[PDB]
Design a protein around this nucleic acid. Sequence first.
RNA 1: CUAACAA
RNA 2: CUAACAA
Lengths: 191, 190
Amino acid sequence: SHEATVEYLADLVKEKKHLTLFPHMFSNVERLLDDEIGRVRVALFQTEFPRVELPEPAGDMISITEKIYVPKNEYPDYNFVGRILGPRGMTAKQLEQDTGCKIMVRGKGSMRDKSKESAHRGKANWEHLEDDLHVLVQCEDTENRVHIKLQAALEQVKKLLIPAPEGTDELKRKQLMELAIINGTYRPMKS
Amino acid sequence: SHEATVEYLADLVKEKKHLTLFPHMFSNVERLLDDEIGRVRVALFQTEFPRVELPEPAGDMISITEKIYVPKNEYPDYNFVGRILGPRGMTAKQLEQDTGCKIMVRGKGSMRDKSKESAHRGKANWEHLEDDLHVLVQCEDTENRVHIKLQAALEQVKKLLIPAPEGTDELKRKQLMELAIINGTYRPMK
RNA sequence: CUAACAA
RNA sequence: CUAACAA
């Protein structure tokens, strides 16, 4: 396997732009190239969280939701939500999958556009806007699995609520790098 | 991974040929297509060599080379070399890889074009031509490994030096079928 | 300098 | 009717 660098991915993409013009003549080799582009993307941008080992289901079904406030006040300038979510919410999805939980960002300043927020305030079904910015972590499994999963996701969400000093944020950098590619380049290179 | 069938390998070989028309546009694609051609080639035609077991290196370094003459006299029409080497030398190369040994086919008749042996016979660095066609089998390792390795290769070269009766040579059949698909003379669409 | 989830 | 290794 060729080293996964951004420079390489760019190379593969320019090739993919040309190769896809002849989808029939080159059907097999386009698939091969899609494979390699996919592999290189995963190695570059995808950061993965530890997966935990679970017993087979046994006991009652339990749904459990923990609320963890984001230390927005203590660190007023740090963008915690953006780093938890990731480009297209990819990081949150990765976390959801790896831990078997559901991640939901809620409370004041949780809406993408803070202007629209001020309108829903008080209204029914939006009562969480009265609360401070928090992450809800939620797992539903059987009595002998649900708490294992939860604790796995809690440990990760808590890590992400500790802001990283300048130039040490490996997670953030991968995110921003991918993001630059998404909205700096055209269609054949994003997603 | 796509399933490795001869129909697929053919298809990949077809594409590689079409790619010759774009000299620079698909450098990475050519390399990737080669990797896959190779992977499939191995899946279809690789011989299964018992994986020998190896002690940890202990002892003095030993380089040993054994010479095995091929019974070219007793079997004057049997292509022994062709069967030892294989298509693109891949049979020999794999034996090399599986045993840690080096395989060299030497002697009179050893050169592809015997017209050339004449030109070199008697010359320097070509003194092996004054000898009968034979196979040098060579390994270099520590003492507790080098003889294990060597016996593995020697056993297999010996096997290959016993000709097979007609149309029961599954090795020769796999070899010429790989060779056909890869040169694109055999193009199964099945 | 990320916006998923839910509606 | 397979041609590697070595120069």
